[PDB]
Amino acid sequence: LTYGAPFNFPRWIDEHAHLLKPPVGARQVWQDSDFIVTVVGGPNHRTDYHDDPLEEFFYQLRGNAYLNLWVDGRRERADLKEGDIFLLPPHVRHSPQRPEAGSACLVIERQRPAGMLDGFEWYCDACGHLVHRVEVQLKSIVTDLPPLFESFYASEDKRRCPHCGQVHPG
Amino acid sequence: LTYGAPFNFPRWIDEHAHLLKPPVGARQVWQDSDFIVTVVGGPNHRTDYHDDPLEEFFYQLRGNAYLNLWVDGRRERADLKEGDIFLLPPHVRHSPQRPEAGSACLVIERQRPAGMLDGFEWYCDACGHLVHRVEVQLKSIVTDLPPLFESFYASEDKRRCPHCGQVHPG
Ligand SMILES: [Fe+2]
Ligand SMILES: [Fe+2]
Ligand SMILES: [Fe+2]
Ligand SMILES: [Fe+2]
């Protein structure tokens, strides 16, 4: 059993509560597995939209959250109330918002094969145009992703909408 | 949203309770998705071991179950007590036993690509030798799998251990 024996999930989440809040916010359950199994806590709000080339499964175990989406060219919202499950199709742009402390969401993804890239995008609050997109071969979320977000927040040029000129807040 | 909006999982399981028992026993949540998301009920005991070429994730939401395994050449058992999660590595032979009525287990698998075959195996209760193995391109569990099991149960020749000659009970 490469990934160990079964174990009690609510107790695991309790024992990792200190990591399910800022600044960490999430915790992957097993390492080096094909299924990426993560528990995401809160609070955490964010402005980036994720373009995942594969599906994402959600089961909101504790508390409530919601996903800001782009669907059919329009901004939409999918609520993840406590007890909700949800399967997100590939490439649907989503921005998870997790307002509640003590919340916990099971999120399951697949490891991306080489050449299958993730995208992270920001959109203009004023005119809705795409402001900035980075594509990334996502291997370790811990090292591959934070610098991406920091480099966007640090640069007015990256944050500048090419259509209406308004600078994204970061 | 190809797969619909989020929805309350405990209520979904309640509304499908009549299918989480014999003769059906399980119910896939979404169709035509890359992630195969199934709720498995009970009671159900079985004698076949599954050789899945990809991982299997378990979260035992209601009631208790256990997996009979082969691990390092020996017969073992992994208990899925209520609240347990578990990630099974590829190819570990497993035979789920679900003794309890009203139990419900979330099981998540991946659709197998072409050329990646599942195996289903039976082992001799007397000498532990492999009795029969069928490999299958698993596309629809509903049509691809029941005839496999029936053809094994119907044939003393398939059930006959090639090492000690004892006929498997089916
Ligand atoms: Fe995502
Ligand atoms: Fe703009
Ligand atoms: Fe299996
Ligand atoms: Fe035998």
Curated annotation (Swiss-Prot), chains A, B:
Keyword annotations: Dioxygenase, Iron, Metal-binding, Oxidoreductase, Plasmid, Pyridine nucleotide biosynthesis
Class in the EC hierarchy, top level: oxidoreductase
Pfam families linked to this entry: 3-HAO
Binding sites annotated in the UniProt record for Fe cation 1: 50, 56, 94
Cofactor note: Binds 2 Fe(2+) ions per subunit.
Binding residues annotated for Fe cation 2, in chain numbering: 124, 127, 161, 164
Effect noted on mutating residue 109 to A: Decreases KM for 3-hydroxyanthranilate 2-fold. Decreases activity 2000-fold
Binding-site residues, O2: 46
This protein's record includes keyword Iron: yes
Keyword Oxidoreductase appears in the UniProt entry: yes
Binding site for substrate: 56, 98, 109
Catalytic activity from the UniProt record: 3-hydroxyanthranilate + O2 = (2Z,4Z)-2-amino-3-carboxymuconate 6-semialdehyde
Co-factor(s): Fe(2+)
GO biological process, one term: quinolinate biosynthetic process
UniProt cross-references to InterPro entries, sorted A to Z: 3hydroanth_dOase, RmlC-like_jellyroll, RmlC_Cupin_sf
Activity regulation details: Inhibited by 4-chloro-3-hydroxyanthranilate. Mechanism of inactivation involves the oxidation of the catalytic active site Fe(2+) to the catalytically inactive Fe(3+) oxidation state, superoxide production, and formation of two disulfide bonds between Cys-124 and Cys-127, and Cys-161 and Cys-164. Enzyme can be reactivated under reducing conditions.
Subunit structure, as described in the record: Homodimer.
Similarity comment text for this entry: Belongs to the 3-HAO family.
Name of the protein in its database record: 3-hydroxyanthranilate 3,4-dioxygenase
